[PDB]
Amino acid sequence: DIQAQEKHNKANAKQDELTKRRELEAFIQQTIQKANKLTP
Amino acid sequence: ALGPGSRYEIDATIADIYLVDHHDRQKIIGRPTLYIVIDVFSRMITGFYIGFENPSYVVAMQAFVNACSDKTAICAQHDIEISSSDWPCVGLPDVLLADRGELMSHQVEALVSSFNVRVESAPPRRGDAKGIVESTFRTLQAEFKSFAPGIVASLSVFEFTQIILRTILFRNNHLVMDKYDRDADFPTDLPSIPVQLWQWGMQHRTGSLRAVEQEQLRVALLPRRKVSISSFGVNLWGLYYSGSEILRPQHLEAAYDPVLVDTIYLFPQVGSRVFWRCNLTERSRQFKGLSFWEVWDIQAQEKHNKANAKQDELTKRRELEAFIQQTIQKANKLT
Amino acid sequence: MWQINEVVLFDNDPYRILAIEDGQVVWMQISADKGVPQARAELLLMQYLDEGRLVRTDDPYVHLDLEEPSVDSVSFQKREEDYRKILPIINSKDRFDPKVRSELVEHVVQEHKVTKATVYKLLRRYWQRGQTPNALIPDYKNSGAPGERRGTKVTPEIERLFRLTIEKHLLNQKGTKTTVAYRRFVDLFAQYFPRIPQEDYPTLRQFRYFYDREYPKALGPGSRYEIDATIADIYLVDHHDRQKIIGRPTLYIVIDVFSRMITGFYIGFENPSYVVAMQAFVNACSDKTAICAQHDIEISSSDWPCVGLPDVLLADRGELMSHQVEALVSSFNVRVESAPPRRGDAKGIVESTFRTLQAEFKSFAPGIASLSVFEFTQIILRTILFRNNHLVMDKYDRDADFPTDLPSIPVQLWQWGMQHRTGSLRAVEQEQLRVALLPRRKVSISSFGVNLWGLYYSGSEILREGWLQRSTQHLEAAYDPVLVDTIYLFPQVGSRVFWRCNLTERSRQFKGLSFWEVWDIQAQEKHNKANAKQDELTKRRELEAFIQQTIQKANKL
Amino acid sequence: MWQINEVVLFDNDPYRILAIEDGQVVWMQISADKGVPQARAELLLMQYLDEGRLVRTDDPYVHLDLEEPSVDSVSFQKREEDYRKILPIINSKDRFDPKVRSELVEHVVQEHKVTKATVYKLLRRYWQRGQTPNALIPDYKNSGAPGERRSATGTAKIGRAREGEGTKVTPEIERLFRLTIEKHLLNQKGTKTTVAYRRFVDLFAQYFPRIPQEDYPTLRQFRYFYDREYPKAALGPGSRYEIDATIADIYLVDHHDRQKIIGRPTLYIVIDVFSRMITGFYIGFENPSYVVAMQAFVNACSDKTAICAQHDIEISSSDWPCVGLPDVLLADRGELMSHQVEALVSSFNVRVESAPPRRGDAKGIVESTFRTLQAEFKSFAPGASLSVFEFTQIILRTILFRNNHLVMDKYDRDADFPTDLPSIPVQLWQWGMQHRTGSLRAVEQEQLRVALLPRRKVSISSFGVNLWGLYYSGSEILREGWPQHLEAAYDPVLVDTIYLFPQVGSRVFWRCNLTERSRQFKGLSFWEVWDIQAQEKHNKA
Amino acid sequence: MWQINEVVLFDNDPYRILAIEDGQVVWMQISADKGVPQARAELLLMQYLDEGRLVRTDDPYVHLDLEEPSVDSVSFQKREEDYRKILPIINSKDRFDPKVRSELVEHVVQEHKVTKATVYKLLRRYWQRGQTPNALIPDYKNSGAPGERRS
DNA sequence: CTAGTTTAAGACTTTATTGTCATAGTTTAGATCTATTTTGTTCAGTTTAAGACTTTATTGTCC
DNA sequence: GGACAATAAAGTCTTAAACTGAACAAAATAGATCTAAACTATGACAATAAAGTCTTAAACTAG
């Protein structure tokens, strides 16, 4: 029953999840860039 | 009605970066190009391939080979844990949109008769691969043109591939389209997200995809060339190969991958795609680990220094001879 | 759930899924030779899977993925025609309904002039083999049963007789022929079957076939050579002793006609002649790594790739010795004919740094500046290396069959000829060729050894063979006119074997010299024997001079 | 990785590699007596080697190339004749192709009149044994079965016929022979095979009484058995010599003290009869005699380099080549002391025969500058400003010139003499020594000199040894310090040293020098001593 | 170059050279009491000298050129008739030929009434000790074992 | 009806079996060559035991 | 102790009869090589026949 509620909540708006995961993607890309710069 | 797996389309782009090896950080590979395959109904990405040369359809068939396989192994190999629901794309589509006149004849024959995939005319493109890349890089336009085999800066490839894979997964699973033309039958509670549309279509309209095995599909789509046979083995592009089945006709043929010169696939009898594997011999062993583009570049360099280098070496050796002769004669005269 | 075109076992019976639709699944059996596709509900399939009646499997018709029939073959055309005929039915949506299937079948029959049975067979093959056009390829590859067995013919009794005769005669035996075994079989068959005439026995062709089946077991490089020579004016000096004078040198060179590449050379300190150029020819057929290494020059095989005998020598037989011509023509298989007019290649080699005199070939006449030879040889060798390897010829004529990327450099032409025209040269051992081409003269034999030119030689073979006693005979010896230390005696007239002889004690005071100065010294000794009478008077005068000087000196005291 | 003429094992079969060319390797089996060479690829050989079916070994014909049959033996001519037949085929570059090979074989058959099978056999032998001429030597060394016995088989008798008939040696006769040999011959010494044969005859008699005596095995058969398997393993240089003498009228003086006058010199010379060459000389100061000419004979047999070097003359061995004893010395036996003749004849083996009439070849040496008086040999009887040095130098240089450069006119050349041979002494000596004489004989100079000196009886006293009224003593006489007729040899030109002979019968000598109480005579000769004593005796009475 | 009557060592064995004529050399060993002189070629001796198989040494019988036995002694007589016995053979140009040598030995045996073995012994002893009359003096000087204790 | 199946006949497709050549390389009996082993006869040079000669140490008879 | 035998020990020599070893020539015997004619194994070509697959025509059949 809880899983159905979680799925409904996720499918309700999904814009907040979109923005949060875009932020996470940008952060991890920047982290990889910094690690590459510091690698040599 | 249209649905997931009814039509596939190709796209490509070029990124303005230079790549290096992951272990040896001092070897420059070149500028990267990206190929992607898009499903028309859901606008979802199905496969990819990274090259380092001019975009062409002959090379774009490797993204189609990728598009029909299971992608768990490559995701795991790049330290990514993935489940089937995030990428459910295994099987063969119905129609592939490309240029029939820009592909080889054997490729079209294999696609049409042996695997039953219809090849039709491609529609105009959009900024799909460009949109994937230009988020954190610089892009210049890429144009497909003919295949030309023969003779005519701190980032590694691993990190580039990891970034590309994570971007693809993010766009597929979480991003929401805006200019999508919705259909009447769509439920109101269904957002324009590629995986949701994929699931709805698979549940309602198409059913499933078709069965296929990867080795035959990959071999059937490689490029081919005529080879020579002699006491030194099999001669292809100037290199020499041998195998166990050879140590046991006028027009034989072999398939090669333009990325690694290590192995080739010889077709012994005509009318069949049964092959033998051939590896490099010691007579060409000093080419191990290279690609065909690098080998062709080396051959071009070797055949280039034969016009003015002749006179340059002539003059240099002439004055060297004059100097040694004069110094020897002077030393003899002194004593 | 399931994919399209996948096979399952349902109670040990293979079935193929043709279409999956919402609430229905259509399948067909691929084991019999009749039937039509049939459908039912997914819940039943789930029930059978839960019970364990359905299991997964592979496709027996997967090999059809490897087929690519050639154009203008029967398989290709038959496949295309069959697919063209049955295309309109499988494209239709209501292809699994018997009624519409019927109207479509007779619609095809009307316009294609084919019976219903063939149309049904084609549809059955398409559905049962994997829903591809390669499923409509005829099975003509099965005709003839390849690899399988099929004026009297062969009978099982005759086969048993064949096996018996082979078993007791051919197997585990050596030195037995097939014809004698055939004769034995003929005897056996005659003594079992007397009625059949003679012209009706099985032949030896059949017997041998059964036994074999049942019991498996233009002008390129090296075509011709040429010889040239020149003279250098400078006087040379001995390297160890900077006071000795040798003389002005003469250079012989050997040239390949095709590539114009230089193969060998020789330096001699006398008048040019065709007898002495044979040493240049001997050098031209050897490996020059050692001679270059000895002169402080490091060389690789690639730099001078010229070892082996040629095919033709260009020289006139009139100026050569008969034994040399015979050895070239017969012993080593080298043809000799007329020499074309020569050009100044040797002078071109030497004119860069020295003044040259014109060289003319004369007859062989044996009998009665601080630069050293080492530096001269080094200079000539390096000049030859540069001229061969890097210098480009401008007046060289190019034939039609040459690539445009081939420069006029002798080594490139040599390699191109090796890889395209003439293969390689023949092999030879150096000592035999060197000895066989030296000049030779008649010798005498006595208890003091072998006498040649007034000198005496001895060896171990003449002692063991006890020859000095039973041979006191017209014998020949070969000599090198540059050193008197060793000679080569031919023990039999027109033979191939030679024995090496060294100087004895009576003549070891000539050691280290050459024959030219030995002949000089002999002429001087003859002149001294002539003028000894005049020398006697001078000796006398010196005698009285000393006597009177001593007497007067004594008288002084 | 592969070398020409290398032998390898392929499935336990030996194969020899003949050639390598552009990916191909030609090989031939060396075990059977049929076949032709085959060709394969090098990649297949590498696969064979990696799998483990191909290994390396040694060539069973390495010894073949180190062979040398003598000329006139059938091996030599057979090899030379067979190598000349197949020469056009092995000199071809198409010799491994069947059709061209057939054409070449047909040409050889038509030319040399030989069958085709012989050509194929010769080619096979050449290829199988190492591609050398020694591969064409026949196998005649195997015929006749060398080293094996012929007694087991046959019935007849092998060998010559008796000039009536014997028997054949059978294995039982061999057993009897071995029994007798083991009994009576092995591990002993001083025993003869004849008595062993006598002992075998008795045993044969008792075993075979029927057989008569004339059919017994003989002693040659027994001896051959025992040996087989019980092994126990005219004129010329230095032929006649002559003596001549002369006197010069000039008076010579001492080199240091020019006041002293020595006298008139006498010259002795020794001549080779054959080539008329001067071999030795001696300068005296008294009337000529043979006893003093023995010193010239002694000097003639030695090496003259030292004496010439002492007089500031440099010569070599080629200028005066006369070292050793001649066969004959030609002088007067009567006018010599008996010990001299005995020593010459017995200890040195030189004959002494009578002298011929003399000549004047000494004058030619001496008369060129000085006036000469007549010289005559007679019996021994003992009891200006010009030094001797310059006179000796002049004599030596004149003799050297006469020996080396002067040409004789009256000499009669021999028949065998080459025309271009000058009539000069040294040339004749060298020619004769090279062709006729050989060499001379060996001698020790000190023994020869001491053996020909004059001898005198001495006396023993407290003062020492008394010779000619002079006193000598030495170290060795002190140990005993003692009269059985002792004797001593002396040199009549110097009185310093004498040679005593202690033991009679041998010429072992002790050296004795002048004592202090008689050395007022030191430095001068015996003639001066005799003159002084004579004048003292004349003026003391 | 060699002289007559010179001693050499060949493989550490002494040999005395007896004659030289036209490239041939006759020599005999001087170690054992049996044998006859042998001849070979001069160039073979040069070969032997080349690689050190033939060297020079001292003559073990030089002490015989010091002996002058007195008249009316046993050595004097014995030497005189022993020399007169073999004088005919040694004055022949075929003394080194086996067959003529056999005939000469037979002649001496008949004329002097002596045994063949004695003649061969005298020839061997003359050739071994230097070819002089003094080589035929008997060894009587060792008899009696002088200067010892009889015991 | 009616949608799907069966059978006999003739032609087509693929390949195994057999008849004749042509030729590079081999086999076979018989004759002759090359080398060996075994025995009879001769002759130049050697061995062996016995007794005699040669030389000298050790002792006897005498002063 | 001196001396003179004087008897014996140690080494050397010749004889007489017998023996020996190397060399030659003639028998008997064992292995190698060549000829001359015929033969054998192999590959290439052409023909023939067997075995499998295919469609047609006409009636049949399960529903």
Curated annotation (Swiss-Prot), chain B:
Q: Where is this region: Catalytic domain (CD)?
A: 6-292
Parent-protein residues present: 263 to 625 of 702
Q: What is this protein called?
A: Transposon Tn7 transposition protein TnsB
Q: What S-S linkages are listed for this chain?
A: none
What is its quaternary makeup? Heteromer with TnsA.
What does the protein in this record do?
A: Sequence-specific, DNA-binding protein required for Tn7 transposition. Recognizes sequences necessary for recombination at both left and right ends of Tn7 and, together with TnsA, forms the transposase. TnsB executes the 3'-DNA strand breakage and joining reactions. TnsB binding introduces DNA bending. There are 3 DNA-binding sites in the left and 4 in the right end of Tn7; as TnsB levels increase more TnsB is bound, suggesting high protein levels contribute to transposon immunity. Binding of TnsB to the transposon right end represses expression of the downstream transposition genes.
Where is each Integrase catalytic domain found? Answer: 1-202
Transmembrane domains' residue ranges: none
Record note on domains: Has 4 domains separated by linkers; DNA-binding domain 1 and 2 (DBD1 and DBD2), a catalytic domain (CD) and the C-terminus (not resolved in structure 7PIK). Binds 21 base pairs (bp) of double-stranded (ds)DNA; binds adjacent sites with a beads-on-a-string architecture making filaments. The CD of 1 subunit interacts with DBD1 of its own, the preceding and the following subunit. Contacts dsDNA via DBD1, DBD2 and the linker between them.
Q: Which domain of life is it from?
A: Bacteria
Curated annotation (Swiss-Prot), chain C:
Q: What is the effect of changing residue 116 to A?
A: Nearly wild-type DNA-binding, 50% transposition efficiency
Q: Which UniProt keywords apply?
A: DNA recombination, DNA-binding, Plasmid, Transposable element, Transposition
Q: Reported effect of changing residue 316 to N?
A: Prevents DNA strand breakage and joining reactions
Keyword Membrane recorded: no
Is DNA-binding there in the keyword field? Answer: yes
Reported effect of changing residue 351 to Q? Prevents DNA strand breakage and joining reactions
Q: Write down the superkingdom of origin.
A: Bacteria
Signal peptide per UniProt: none
Note down the stretches annotated as region DNA-binding domain 2 (DBD2). 155-215
Q: Where is the Integrase catalytic domain?
A: 218-418
Record-linked PROSITE patterns:
INTEGRASE
Portion annotated as DNA-binding: 105-124
Q: What happens when you mutate residue 205 to A?
A: Reduced DNA-binding, loss of transposition
Region annotation (DNA-binding domain 1 (DBD1)) ranges: 1-139
GO process annotations (BP): DNA integration; DNA transposition
Q: Name one GO molecular function term.
A: DNA binding
Q: Which GO terms describe its cellular component?
A: chromosome
Spans annotated as Catalytic domain (CD): 223-515
Record text on subunit structure and interactions: Heteromer with TnsA.
Q: What does this protein do?
A: Sequence-specific, DNA-binding protein required for Tn7 transposition. Recognizes sequences necessary for recombination at both left and right ends of Tn7 and, together with TnsA, forms the transposase. TnsB executes the 3'-DNA strand breakage and joining reactions. TnsB binding introduces DNA bending. There are 3 DNA-binding sites in the left and 4 in the right end of Tn7; as TnsB levels increase more TnsB is bound, suggesting high protein levels contribute to transposon immunity. Binding of TnsB to the transposon right end represses expression of the downstream transposition genes.
What domain notes does the record hold? Has 4 domains separated by linkers; DNA-binding domain 1 and 2 (DBD1 and DBD2), a catalytic domain (CD) and the C-terminus (not resolved in structure 7PIK). Binds 21 base pairs (bp) of double-stranded (ds)DNA; binds adjacent sites with a beads-on-a-string architecture making filaments. The CD of 1 subunit interacts with DBD1 of its own, the preceding and the following subunit. Contacts dsDNA via DBD1, DBD2 and the linker between them.
In Swiss-Prot or TrEMBL terms, this protein is called Transposon Tn7 transposition protein TnsB
